[PDB]
Write an enzyme that holds these catalytic residues in place. Structure first.
Site, PDB file in Angstrom:
ATOM      1  N   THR A   1       0.834  -1.195  -0.151  1.00  0.00           N
ATOM      2  CA  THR A   1       0.127  -0.083   0.034  1.00  0.00           C
ATOM      3  C   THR A   1       0.698   1.783  -0.080  1.00  0.00           C
ATOM      4  O   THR A   1       0.335   2.348  -0.021  1.00  0.00           O
ATOM      5  CB  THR A   1      -0.768  -0.082   1.327  1.00  0.00           C
ATOM      6  OG1 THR A   1      -1.949   1.089   0.951  1.00  0.00           O
ATOM      7  CG2 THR A   1      -0.230   0.484   2.697  1.00  0.00           C
TER       8      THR A   1
ATOM      9  N   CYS B   1      29.127  27.415   6.635  1.00  0.00           N
ATOM     10  CA  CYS B   1      30.204  28.270   6.190  1.00  0.00           C
ATOM     11  C   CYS B   1      31.275  28.273   7.510  1.00  0.00           C
ATOM     12  O   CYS B   1      30.638  28.244   8.073  1.00  0.00           O
ATOM     13  CB  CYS B   1      30.160  29.125   5.942  1.00  0.00           C
ATOM     14  SG  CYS B   1      28.461  29.729   5.076  1.00  0.00           S
TER      15      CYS B   1
ATOM     16  N   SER C   1      53.059  25.465   4.636  1.00  0.00           N
ATOM     17  CA  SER C   1      54.464  24.339   5.725  1.00  0.00           C
ATOM     18  C   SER C   1      53.297  23.089   5.612  1.00  0.00           C
ATOM     19  O   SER C   1      52.035  22.474   5.312  1.00  0.00           O
ATOM     20  CB  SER C   1      54.578  24.426   6.510  1.00  0.00           C
ATOM     21  OG  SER C   1      53.168  25.034   7.339  1.00  0.00           O
TER      22      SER C   1
ATOM     23  N   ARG D   1      63.391  23.423   1.653  1.00  0.00           N
ATOM     24  CA  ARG D   1      64.975  23.451   2.461  1.00  0.00           C
ATOM     25  C   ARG D   1      65.800  23.289   1.757  1.00  0.00           C
ATOM     26  O   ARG D   1      67.122  22.683   1.694  1.00  0.00           O
ATOM     27  CB  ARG D   1      64.476  21.841   3.160  1.00  0.00           C
ATOM     28  CG  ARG D   1      65.212  21.717   4.227  1.00  0.00           C
ATOM     29  CD  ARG D   1      63.990  20.927   5.170  1.00  0.00           C
ATOM     30  NE  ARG D   1      63.731  19.338   4.304  1.00  0.00           N
ATOM     31  CZ  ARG D   1      62.928  18.845   5.064  1.00  0.00           C
ATOM     32  NH1 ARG D   1      61.961  18.880   5.482  1.00  0.00           N
ATOM     33  NH2 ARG D   1      63.008  17.483   4.553  1.00  0.00           N
TER      34      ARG D   1
ATOM     35  N   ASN E   1      34.051  31.938   0.982  1.00  0.00           N
ATOM     36  CA  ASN E   1      33.744  30.092   1.702  1.00  0.00           C
ATOM     37  C   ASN E   1      33.140  29.295   0.488  1.00  0.00           C
ATOM     38  O   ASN E   1      33.178  29.913  -1.361  1.00  0.00           O
ATOM     39  CB  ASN E   1      32.359  30.492   2.114  1.00  0.00           C
ATOM     40  CG  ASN E   1      31.314  31.526   2.262  1.00  0.00           C
ATOM     41  OD1 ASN E   1      31.237  32.359   1.081  1.00  0.00           O
ATOM     42  ND2 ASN E   1      29.902  30.396   2.629  1.00  0.00           N
TER      43      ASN E   1
ATOM     44  N   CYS F   1      30.226  29.429  -1.184  1.00  0.00           N
ATOM     45  CA  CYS F   1      29.084  29.918  -2.300  1.00  0.00           C
ATOM     46  C   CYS F   1      29.064  31.805  -2.617  1.00  0.00           C
ATOM     47  O   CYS F   1      28.217  32.245  -2.163  1.00  0.00           O
ATOM     48  CB  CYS F   1      27.764  30.374  -1.377  1.00  0.00           C
ATOM     49  SG  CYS F   1      27.035  28.348  -1.126  1.00  0.00           S
TER      50      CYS F   1
ATOM     51  N   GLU G   1      29.498  34.100   0.002  1.00  0.00           N
ATOM     52  CA  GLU G   1      28.667  35.621   1.041  1.00  0.00           C
ATOM     53  C   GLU G   1      29.738  35.878   1.624  1.00  0.00           C
ATOM     54  O   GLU G   1      29.151  36.730   2.531  1.00  0.00           O
ATOM     55  CB  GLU G   1      27.816  35.206   0.898  1.00  0.00           C
ATOM     56  CG  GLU G   1      26.634  33.632   1.903  1.00  0.00           C
ATOM     57  CD  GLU G   1      27.446  32.006   1.411  1.00  0.00           C
ATOM     58  OE1 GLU G   1      28.189  32.298   0.674  1.00  0.00           O
ATOM     59  OE2 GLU G   1      26.567  31.780   2.152  1.00  0.00           O
TER      60      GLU G   1
ATOM     61  N   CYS H   1      30.741  30.746  10.230  1.00  0.00           N
ATOM     62  CA  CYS H   1      29.535  31.578  10.240  1.00  0.00           C
ATOM     63  C   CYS H   1      28.257  30.476  10.685  1.00  0.00           C
ATOM     64  O   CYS H   1      28.046  29.487   9.358  1.00  0.00           O
ATOM     65  CB  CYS H   1      29.724  31.998   9.010  1.00  0.00           C
ATOM     66  SG  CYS H   1      28.113  33.562   8.910  1.00  0.00           S
TER      67      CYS H   1
ATOM     68  N   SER I   1      17.214  25.397   1.592  1.00  0.00           N
ATOM     69  CA  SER I   1      16.379  26.013   2.576  1.00  0.00           C
ATOM     70  C   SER I   1      15.150  26.992   2.308  1.00  0.00           C
ATOM     71  O   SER I   1      14.033  26.771   2.454  1.00  0.00           O
ATOM     72  CB  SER I   1      17.474  27.099   3.954  1.00  0.00           C
ATOM     73  OG  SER I   1      18.182  27.824   2.704  1.00  0.00           O
TER      74      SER I   1
ATOM     75  N   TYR J   1      29.792  34.863  -7.999  1.00  0.00           N
ATOM     76  CA  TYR J   1      28.991  33.323  -7.775  1.00  0.00           C
ATOM     77  C   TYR J   1      29.353  32.959  -9.186  1.00  0.00           C
ATOM     78  O   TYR J   1      29.719  32.989 -10.302  1.00  0.00           O
ATOM     79  CB  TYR J   1      27.770  33.546  -7.432  1.00  0.00           C
ATOM     80  CG  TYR J   1      27.535  31.893  -6.638  1.00  0.00           C
ATOM     81  CD1 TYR J   1      29.085  30.928  -6.118  1.00  0.00           C
ATOM     82  CD2 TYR J   1      26.481  31.325  -5.819  1.00  0.00           C
ATOM     83  CE1 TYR J   1      28.264  30.325  -5.257  1.00  0.00           C
ATOM     84  CE2 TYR J   1      26.457  30.620  -5.556  1.00  0.00           C
ATOM     85  CZ  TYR J   1      27.227  29.310  -5.028  1.00  0.00           C
ATOM     86  OH  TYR J   1      27.231  27.658  -4.611  1.00  0.00           O
ATOM     87  N   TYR J   2      27.842  32.196  -8.974  1.00  0.00           N
ATOM     88  CA  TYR J   2      27.406  31.477 -10.589  1.00  0.00           C
ATOM     89  C   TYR J   2      27.550  32.466 -11.820  1.00  0.00           C
ATOM     90  O   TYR J   2      26.934  33.304 -11.376  1.00  0.00           O
ATOM     91  CB  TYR J   2      26.174  30.558 -10.128  1.00  0.00           C
ATOM     92  CG  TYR J   2      26.217  29.744  -9.378  1.00  0.00           C
ATOM     93  CD1 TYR J   2      27.299  29.039  -9.149  1.00  0.00           C
ATOM     94  CD2 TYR J   2      25.196  29.255  -8.575  1.00  0.00           C
ATOM     95  CE1 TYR J   2      27.225  27.844  -8.891  1.00  0.00           C
ATOM     96  CE2 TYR J   2      24.570  28.119  -7.929  1.00  0.00           C
ATOM     97  CZ  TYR J   2      26.467  27.351  -7.690  1.00  0.00           C
ATOM     98  OH  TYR J   2      26.465  26.199  -7.236  1.00  0.00           O
TER      99      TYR J   2
END
Ligand code: TTP
Ligand code: TTP
Ligand code: TTP
Ligand code: GDP
Ligand code: DAT
Ligand code: MG
Ligand code: MG
Ligand code: MG
Lengths: 736, 35, 109
Positions: A55, A225, A233, A269, A437, A439, A441, A462, A625, A730-731
């Protein structure tokens, strides 16, 4: 020849197939909707009946069927398919439709290890039953289908091996509010827990993926973020790698700064070894990012940063291009090229750009961010030194290589480091911004590590949230909404854990927040404005002034209550300098809107009491989101009235808010003549935004002669962005 | 009209009842621009 | 630079802390003339539950890729390049996927 077939119910039992059960479910979900058809959903399901059919497979099929009917002519299918899916998720988690009591559920879940143990310790049974009266389970009937599939796929507490869904949508909301204000005094605790629940469940405030999916579970990491800086090093590279592995495993997205790594061929070195170059270390960073997080909510992703004048810059720009051999390709990470005013000047004048290894130019790297004058001095001097290893490239060709790889891959980003420091909440001498970061922002200070637990390094964290511009009816509503958002995130910093000691150092010292906006395109439609023509310029100035003012005022009042953040003295706010002072003065030619809020009183108040948070505002893309409130993501215009977005199950059809009434007011992404109108709005926003904005640039090849996008316009737009103080790019979306 | 206004409950019935990048740059045009 | 042991044997436990420690140790010793032997047989198989079921275990291969980039990260410019041999038991659940990791066919993943 009736066969009398059997179906398998959810509880394992079997009964005769009865189509009226399917009729009733669909009739229930289509109630009140316009231009939908029960008959259409059943026939388009093409449901294949066999004796013993589950079902749940029957119901999951008609969900997909109604979901694929979401169209411009029949937009209300977004609610038909959502109600079928909400109904499906109730059974999956509870065995019935009606959810249990809030207390009974938390008890069972903490016992199973799915909720954090502290929920039962910090709240009494009398308080749990009292929060159950806050819950409105009928608010589950306001999601769209795309929203519910993100809840089922990413946010609701579940088993990533079983697929077993454990909770409802309103339980997620009420517990994110409970956990965040769990440390508040009892005289005001439940007042906030109710207020914050209502704010997020009625889509006034938007919460990020790690907060939605995490805040109530044992594993406490909820900052989207993570910014790590790498020193030149082996100890620093090892620490950077170990920090990445830790934070990909805990819902985070990284920005890596490996610009300090010396160029290929430099002596090791004294000359005992030949430096293999940056690429073999970038490959090590890539395997770290993709090592472990593909089983969680989302895979690990990172963007690596390097200065444009790096000696290997020609080899680094092509790391994503799908051609060439594997030895010189690092495809599964994104990259941000760091540029300042001097670099652009060489392009306009048609001169050359000299490439250096950061190990052979003492003090040039740090000056590249903090001191623009000292950079021009050191750069021009090192250009004349012939003992220093260098390599000249025509600025036109180098910029052409970058923009060519940016256009084809879409994931080669730009960071104007001089703008990131002349117009920042940080003093470049004490805490310069040297990277961004995933994206683009976030702009926060960082210091490289010598060990995984090096106390003297700083990893910038962040934590995010967003204001739904479509849910507010007056800009002064942001006052109460900023208080609720800032308090919840600032309490989150003390509530969560930190896998890397250097990361806790920055989060507790600076308490950097990144609050942005969603539903900006829908917001412009309601005001009868558009992106391209520039009719939203004054409105954007008035809107984002109120956003920043009420955010600062919220964090300033919180500083009176619990003290400013420890390292507040390193901020430009401490010196009494506000974003309304350091913005690029070219913005005055595209916006004549005066300031409408009492910034001078806040300036004095910030001088006296400080700020609880070093940063507050950052405009993130909110790809995932924002779908919860069916909003148009971030500041971007929607791709269509019905947009196609990716998901775990498949494609999702998302209708723009208030389509039937406002479909003419919307300016779709490809209905824009160019980028100048959008880039101006990004520049106007950046006047008040603490960090940066995930600004896109978009190009339609058919809008240009001969069907190819000119390199001239790619550069003119890149220069237009710098003129108005845009910090990052960005994009780059290219149609078809 | 004797019945309430309604959208077509069986819309499927209507089927049966009818038959690169232009690589050229202009540096002089770019200098005509103030950062 | 005083490092003169030709052979380095590192054993990896079934934790991110151990994998991180292993990788960092590999990077250090490849940079100092050594040849590594890695024991990653303890790492749990693809599909196993993480933290009770909070995550889907991506498997050994995504971590083996991490061990490889550590070996080839830095020693190619020195006297000799870095090289390593990884060990796993025959009865490991992914053993059919591990035997073909060197074969030149199949995708990079
Ligand atoms: C949630 C809800 C469902 N319904 C409808 C949708 C479902 O078809 C039905 C509830 O489903 P069930 O109570 O599961 O009924 P069923 O027809 O599947 O029979 P059984 O499981 O006992 O074999 O009622 C309402 O009328 N009002 C409501 O508030
Ligand atoms: C020792 C070593 C370093 N490196 C690289 C990694 C770093 O980017 C850079 C510095 O490594 P470090 O760990 O700083 O090396 P060191 O301090 O022994 O030598 P130096 O005086 O040159 O700093 O060299 C290699 O690629 N291979 C090696 O074997
Ligand atoms: C947390 C986490 C672990 N892992 C893998 C790496 C290790 O081989 C294995 C064990 O990780 P551990 O570091 O042992 O994780 P843990 O102790 O928090 O969880 P458990 O109680 O399950 O041991 O899980 C991932 O692949 N991704 C992740 O996000
Ligand atoms: N690991 C990981 N992190 C991401 C991804 N997308 C976004 N992030 C993080 O989330 C932050 C803001 O992204 P946003 O678009 O708001 O995503 P959302 O908040 O999850 O909907 C970024 O700075 C990233 O650090 C992803 O695909 N994987
Ligand atoms: N006897 C039956 N024959 C065919 N389909 C049925 C059925 N009973 C229920 N369904 C369908 C209708 C719903 O869309 C879907 C899920 O129903 P449910 O009420 O969640 O499951 P159940 O009644 O098995 O507990 O299954
Ligand atoms: Mg039923
Ligand atoms: Mg050194
Ligand atoms: Mg463990």
């Amino acid at each position: 020849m009736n066969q009398n077939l059997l179906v398998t119910k959810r509880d394992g039992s079997t009964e005769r197939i009865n189509l009226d059960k399917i009729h009733r479910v669909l009739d229930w979900a289509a109630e009140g909707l316009h231009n939908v058809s029960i008959s259409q959903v059943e026939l388009r399901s093409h449901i294949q009946f066999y004796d013993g059919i589950k079902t749940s497979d029957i119901h999951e099929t008609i969900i997909k069927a109604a979901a694929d009917l979401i169209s411009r002519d029949a937009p209300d299918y977004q609610y038909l398919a959502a109600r079928l899916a909400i109904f499906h998720l109730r059974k999956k988690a509870y065995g019935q439709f009606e959810p249990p009591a809030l207390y009974d559920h938390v008890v069972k879940m903490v016992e199973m290890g799915k909720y954090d143990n502290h929920l039962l310790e910090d709240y009494t049974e009398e308080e749990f039953k009292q929060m159950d009266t806050f819950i409105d389970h009928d608010r589950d009937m306001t999601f769209s289908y795309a929203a519910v599939k993100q809840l089922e796929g990413k946010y609701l507490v579940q088993n990533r091996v079983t697929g077993e869904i454990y909770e409802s949508a309103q339980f997620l909301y009420i517990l994110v509010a409970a956990c965040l204000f769990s440390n508040y005094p009892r005289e005001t605790r439940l007042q906030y827990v109710k207020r914050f629940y209502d704010a997020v469940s009625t889509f006034k405030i938007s919460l990020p993926t790690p907060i939605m999916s995490g805040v109530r579970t044992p594993t406490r990491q909820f900052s989207s973020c993570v910014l790590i800086e790498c020193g030149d090093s082996l100890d620093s590279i090892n620490a950077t790698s170990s920090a990445i592995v830790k934070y990909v495993s805990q819902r985070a997205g990284i920005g890596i700064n490996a610009g300090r790594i010396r160029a290929l061929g430099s002596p090791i070195r004294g000359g005992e070894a030949f430096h293999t170059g940056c690429i073999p270390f970038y490959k090590h960073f890539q395997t770290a990012v993709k090592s472990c997080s593909q089983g969680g909510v989302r895979g690990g992703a990172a963007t690596l940063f390097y200065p444009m004048w790096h000696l290997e810059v020609e080899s680094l720009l092509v790391l994503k291009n799908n051609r060439g051999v594997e030895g010189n390709r690092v495809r599964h990470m994104d990259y941000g090229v760091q540029i300042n005013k001097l670099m652009y000047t060489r392009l306009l004048k048609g001169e050359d750009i000299t490439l250096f290894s950061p190990s052979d130019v003492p003090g040039l790297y740090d000056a590249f961010f903090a001191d623009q004058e000292e950079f021009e001095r050191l750069y021009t001097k090192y250009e004349k030194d012939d003992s220093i290893r260098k390599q000249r490239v025509k600025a036109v060709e180098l910029f052409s290589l970058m923009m060519q790889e940016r256009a084809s891959t879409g994931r080669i980003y730009i960071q104007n480091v001089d703008h990131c420091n002349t117009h920042s909440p940080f003093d470049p001498a004490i805490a310069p911004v040297r990277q961004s970061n995933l994206c683009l922002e976030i702009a926060l200070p960082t210091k490289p590590l010598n060990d995984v637990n090096d106390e003297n390094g700083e990893i910038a964290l962040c934590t995010l949230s967003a204001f739904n511009l479509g849910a507010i009816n007056n800009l002064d509503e942001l006052e109460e909404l900023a208080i609720l958002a800032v308090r919840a995130l600032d309490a989150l910093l003390d509530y969560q854990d930190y896998p890397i000691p250097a990361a806790k150092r920055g989060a507790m010292g600076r308490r950097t927040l990144g609050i942005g906006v969603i539903n900006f395109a829908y917001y412009l439609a309601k005001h009868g404005k558009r992106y391209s023509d520039g009719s939203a310029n004054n409105l954007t100035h008035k809107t984002f002034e109120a956003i920043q003012y009420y955010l600062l005022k919220a964090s300033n009042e919180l500083a009176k209550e619990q003290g400013a953040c420890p390292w507040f003295n390193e901020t430009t706010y401490a010196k009494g300098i506000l974003p309304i002072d350091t913005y690029k003065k070219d913005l005055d030619t595209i916006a004549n809107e005066p300031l409408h809020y009492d910034w001078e009183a806040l300036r004095e108040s910030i001088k006296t009491h400080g700020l609880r948070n070093s940063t507050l505002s950052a405009l993130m893309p909110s790809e995932t989101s924002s779908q919860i409130s069916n909003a148009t993501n971030g500041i971007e215009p929607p791709r269509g009235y019905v947009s196609i977005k990716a998901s775990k199950d498949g494609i999702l059809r998302q209708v723009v808010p208030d389509y039937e009434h406002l479909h003419d007011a919307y300016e779709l992404l490809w209905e824009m003549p160019g980028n100048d109108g959008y880039l101006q709005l990004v520049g106007i926003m950046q006047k008040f935004i603490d960090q940066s904005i995930s600004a896109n640039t978009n190009y339609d090849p058919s809008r240009f002669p001969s069907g190819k996008v000119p390199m001239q316009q790619l550069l003119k737009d890149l220069l237009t962005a710098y003129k108005f103080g845009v910090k990052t790019l960005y994009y780059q979306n290219t149609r078809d | 009209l004797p019945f309430q206004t309604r959208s077509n409950p069986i819309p499927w019935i209507n089927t049966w009842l009818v038959s690169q990048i232009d690589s050229e740059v202009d540096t002089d045009d770019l200098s005509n621009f103030q950062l």
